[PDB]
Design a protein around this ligand. Sequence first.
Ligand code: ZN
Ligand code: ZN
Lengths: 137, 136
Amino acid sequence: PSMEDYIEQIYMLIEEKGYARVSDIAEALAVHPSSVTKMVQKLDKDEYLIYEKYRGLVLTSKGKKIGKRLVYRHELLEQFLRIIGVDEEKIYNDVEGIEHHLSWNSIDRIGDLVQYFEEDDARKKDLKSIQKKTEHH
Amino acid sequence: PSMEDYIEQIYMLIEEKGYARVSDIAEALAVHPSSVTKMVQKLDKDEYLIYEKYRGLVLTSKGKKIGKRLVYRHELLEQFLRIIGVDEEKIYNDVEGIEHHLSWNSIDRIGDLVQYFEEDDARKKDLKSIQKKTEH
Ligand SMILES: [Zn+2]
Ligand SMILES: [Zn+2]
């Protein structure tokens, strides 16, 4: 997991539970707690989050903005693969593997693509028609 | 560099030069020759290629089929990012980063999408109109 992977999951946990426990981060990323503590320290140093005494892990404004961006990117990519017809079961793992290796330019263009299809269902129908061609013929 | 990264580059060198030198593979993947030798041995064990006392490394039919599919995948993804409007200069690095992490289902669906736009320019024009809209 990259730094973006950690911030993405920390943001999600804070929104889901209201806080992000090291044990919960470790579970979400399927890694050892030590790996989390190491990354958390790096994120603290880079000012993405803090840990004032008790209370707990808290994202800084910089961490919150990036986290929101990452969840947006994840959601958008799933919608993209869903719209173009990828089997639902395969969508998550694919987004997991590509999301943090795409420039913002690509993300924003994929965003335009999604809007393109959402704007007129007729385009989705024509796309399905093409899938039928490339299917047999 | 993953196993697929190596096969993709080896296939390309063979198509370009007619052979894949360890040094050319190291330069293409920006890695040390030692890492190449290690990977080549793994690829040999896995039967993707073999070594010849006079022709260097040769891909087996399994390696050739994979290599061809990898180059197809790379080219397809570049065309996809290109048709949807990504700045040309950013396309290569994006494809390099995602290409070997997409299922065939996704690759084939992206293939249909490319055909969808290549079939009627009006669709390209309409996508451009939306980009102007999302631009506000
Ligand atoms: Zn994600
Ligand atoms: Zn490639």
